[PDB]
Amino acid sequence: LGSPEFMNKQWYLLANQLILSLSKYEGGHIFEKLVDAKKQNCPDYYDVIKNPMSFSCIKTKLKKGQYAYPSEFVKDVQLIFDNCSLYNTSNSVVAITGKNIETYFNNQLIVMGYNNFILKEKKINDMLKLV
Ligand SMILES: Cc1cc(C(N)=O)ccc1-c1[nH]c(C)c2c1CCCCC2=O
């Protein structure tokens, strides 16, 4: 019940619930799929954003088991909000929406206790490099 596999199954379920609540939050539809430069009238998006990321890209990596640490899931989610704060002007609707979901995501990490999984990840790496 306390095995490393039980914890690894836990934060995979917490991340899967997190990426669902982000997809359902207000304005979350603008981060679900990757930006189609032609349909959204942004021909220079991938000339500025070189590491694109969307909710669908994170759901796929969760389904294929491509996250080794719980901190890697947060980095992909934060990358979405970082690409949003970069390409979009600070007073644009998208940038405001991105900041609102960013706060929601960070507060959901507190409520769900996901951060405690990242801390134990760091301690385990310490108690492993010491041997
Ligand atoms: C993909 C997308 C879809 C819709 C939709 N179909 O409702 C609305 C907005 C956006 C969107 N998402 C991001 C992440 C952005 C944009 C708009 C373009 C500027 C780049 C940017 O930050």
Author numbering: 3 to 133
From the paper:
In this study, the focus is on the essential Bromodomain protein 1 (PfBDP1) of the malaria pathogen Plasmodium falciparum. Possible targets are the nine predicted bromodomain (BRD) proteins, among which PfBDP1 has been identified as essential in the blood stage of P. falciparum. PfBDP1 is involved in regulating erythrocyte invasion genes and conditional knockdown (KD) of PfBDP1 lead to a significantly reduced multiplication rate during the intraerythrocytic development cycle (IDC). PfBDP1 is recruited to promoters of invasion‐related genes by binding with its BRD to acetylated histones.
BP and BM are very similar to PfBDP1‐BRD‐RMM2, with most of the methyl group orientated the same way but also with a much smaller proportion rotated by 180°. The amide does not appear to interact directly with the BP in the crystal, but this does not have to be the case in solution. Notably, His354 forms a hydrogen bond to a symmetry equivalent and may be no longer available. Based on the two conformations of RMM23 in the PfBDP1‐BRD co‐crystal structure, this should be possible for RMM23 and RMM22, but not for RMM21 (compared to RMM20). Treatment of synchronous ring‐stage 3D7 and NF54 parasite cultures with RMM23 resulted in significantly reduced growth after 48 h of treatment, indicating that the compound blocked parasite development within the same IDC when treatment was initiated. The conditional KD parasites (10 nM Shld1) exhibited increased sensitivity against RMM23, which was reflected by a leftward shift in the dose–response curve compared to standard conditions (500 nM Shld1). In contrast, the EC50 of chloroquine was unchanged. This observation is consistent with RMM23 acting directly on PfBDP1. To examine whether RMM23 inhibits chromatin binding of PfBDP1‐BRD, we performed ChIP of PfBDP1HA in schizont stage parasites cultivated for 3 h with 50 μM RMM23 or DMSO control. Analysis of several known PfBDP1 target loci by qPCR revealed significantly diminished enrichment of PfBDP1 in the presence of RMM23, further supporting PfBDP1‐BRD as the main target of RMM23 in P. falciparum parasites. Using in vitro assays combined with conditional KD of PfBDP1, we identified RMM23 as a PfBDP1‐specific inhibitor that demonstrated effective binding and inhibition of parasite growth.
